[PDB]
Amino acid sequence: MKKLKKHPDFPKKPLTPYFRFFMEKRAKYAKLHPEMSNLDLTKILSKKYKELPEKKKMKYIQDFQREKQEFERNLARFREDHPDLIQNAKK
């Protein structure tokens, strides 16, 4: 009996290191997975991204936190909305 997304209470507009890594090279899989769909490639990016020694992620996460920090800084100001029943309207 109420709608709600990831806008109120800790907004998550920016992208994640895995996103800027997946969505960025996804093209590399959409072009190399002619006999597949996307689940096959997706699994591939889930193995590499994790395997990463956090040596390169520190850069990505620093890119995700760089904006999420300045964004949520003044953007989160709208989080004043205390009343928020079950925040999850993703079907």
Residues constituting the chain: 91
Number of domains present in the structure of the chain: 1
Which H or E run includes 16? none
**Contact, 68 vs 20, CB < 8 A?**
no
Single-letter amino acid, residue 71: F
Domain that includes residue 55, residue range: 1-91
Phi, psi of 17 (to 5 degrees): -50, -40
State the chain's maximal CA–CA distance in angstroms: 49
Q: Name the burial class of residue 42, with classes exposed (0-12), middle (13-18) and buried (19+) by CB atoms within 10 angstroms of its CB.
A: middle
- CATH number for the domain spanning 63: value is 1.10.30.10
